[PDB]
Structures are given as C-alpha cells and as structure tokens.
C-alpha cells in the first residue's frame, strides 16, 4: 500500500415519522404523525402537551 486518505463526513439527522422511540419502563412506539401546534390538546392555561 503506497498511501491512504481518510475522510470523515458528518450528517445532521432530524427526527421524522417512522423512527422508534421508547420509555424507561418497556413502553415502545413508532412516531406516527407530526401534528400542527394548534391541533394538540391544551390546558386552560394554554400550554399544549
């Protein structure tokens, strides 16, 4: 081998529908839909879940 050139690529992956998410207690799930802010439930104070 005369010589070698290594190149590192870095890629920013954002969460999207189909990825797997879980809790600490064994509950699992696939992220199914991204809802608009307005559709999400909100308490009287206005903070959405």
């Amino acid at each position: 081998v005369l010589k070698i050139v290594k190149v590192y690529l870095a890629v920013k992956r954002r969460i999207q529908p189909g990825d797997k998410m879980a809790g600490r207690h064994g509950n699992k799930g696939v992220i199914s839909k991204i809802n608009p802010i307005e559709d999400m439930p909100y308490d009287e104070n206005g903070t959405p879940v």
Binding site: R14, P36, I37, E38, Y42, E44, N45, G46, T47
Partner: protein, 231 residues
C-alpha cells in the same frame, strides 16, 4: 336585529404578555371566535428571523474558535432566539464585531434604522481573551410558518460560499394563547358573554396588529366562501 362585537380595553401587563377583551358577543359565538382566533394566531402570524450566518474563522458548523467556550452549534442555537422587527426591507444584513473579555450580547449589534432589536440583553457568546475577536454578518428575512434548512436545500440558489451556515427558520412570533368566555352582564340583556384573549409573544408583534391581521385573514377566506356558483 343582531349584536356585534366591539374591541374594548387592551391591558398590557408586561412587554410580552397581553390581555385583549371583546365585550358584546352574542350567545354561542364565544367559543367559536375564541378557537378560530387561537388557531389563526398560532398558525399564520408572519414574522422575521435569521436565515443564515457567516463567521470569519470557521469553515463549518462543527469547528471551534480559540478563546470561546461555547461550540459553534450553540452559537446558532443562541441566534435562533433573536427577536427582531424589520419595517421596510425584506432582507437585512446585521454586523456584529466585538473584542476583549466579556459577554457578547445582542446589544452590541450595529444600530440600524429599520431594524429593532427587541431584547438587547439577550446573550450571544462569552469571550475569554483580551485579543480574541469575533466578527459575523447575520442575514434576516421575513416569512411565515416553519421552514428548515434541509427542505430549502432543494432550492439552494447558489449556496456556493462554504462559509455559509444555514439555520432553520421559525417564522412565527406567538408562543402561547389562551381564552376565556365569561358572562358579560350588559345593562339591557340577561345572558351575554365577553371573550378575553390572553396572549404571550416574543415581543415583536403588537396585540392590536395581531388581532387585526388574524381577523383580516379569516374574513378574506370567509368572503371567498360566501359565493357558491352552483352553475
């Protein structure tokens, strides 16, 4: 023979937090209007935000400068929160130049006429060396909704300068909206209600203008609905 709602006192508790009241609402339209406005406000308010940044000594988002402790990515995260009001132009170029030890806050930006920096205390960086100097040019656009870099990458339109650092655009000023419809005892009526809209924003859009624009958009779309051809 109907009633119709008139905009009444608009209390301002803080610079960001505001209460707007609408007194003469007919029975049943309270919740309808409350929800419609909440939706329009949260969804469609146009605002301006930084779209991309160029810093001098940095090739890409992941490198690091001498004499700073935050990573470049955290610098972008700080820039995302800058609340700014642009009046005339669509694209403005702000310039930040600071040297010496100290926290580089938003106040140090070169003061231009048409641009208003709402929160000058907002921190950007911390220098740690007398001779350490940062210069950057931040390009701010007007827009609606939420557009990430990666979608706009299809429409690059000569993104050629490798020094360019794209930031996701959250083109939306409103953080929170709540409303309460409560009995509005009007001197000649039994059962009338008043709608109270409590709103929390980043301090760019004024309440009156927000409500006016929302009503404008809803009225325009309803106008579009009024006619039905049936032809």
């Amino acid at each position: 023979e109907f009633l119709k709602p008139r905009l009444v006192d608009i209390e301002q508790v803080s610079s960001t937090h505001a209460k707007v009241t609408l007194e003469p609402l007919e029975r049943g339209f309270g919740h309808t209007l409350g929800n419609a406005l909440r939706r329009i406000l949260l969804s469609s308010m146009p605002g301006c935000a930084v779209t991309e940044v160029e810093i001098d000594g940095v090739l890409h988002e992941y490198s690091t400068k001498e004499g700073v402790q935050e990573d470049i990515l955290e610098i972008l995260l700080n820039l995302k929160g800058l609340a700014v009001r642009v009046q005339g132009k669509d694209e403005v170029i702000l310039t930040l130049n600071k040297s010496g030890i100290g926290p580089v806050t938003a106040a140090d930006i070169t003061h231009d006429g048409d641009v208003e920096i709402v929160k000058p205390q907002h921190v950007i960086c911390h220098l740690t060396d007398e001779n350490a100097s940062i210069s950057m040019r931040i390009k701010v656009q007007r827009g609606r909704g939420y557009v990430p870099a990666s979608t706009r990458i299809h429409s690059e339109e000569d993104e050629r300068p490798i020094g360019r650092l794209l930031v996701d655009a959250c083109y939306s000023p409103v953080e929170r909206i709540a409303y309460n419809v409560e009995a509005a005892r009007v001197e000649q009526r039994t059962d009338l209600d008043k709608l109270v809209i409590e709103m929390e924003t980043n301090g760019t859009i004024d309440p009156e203008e927000a409500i006016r624009r929302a009503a404008t958009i809803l009225a325009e779309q309803l106008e579009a609905f009024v006619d039905l051809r049936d032809v």
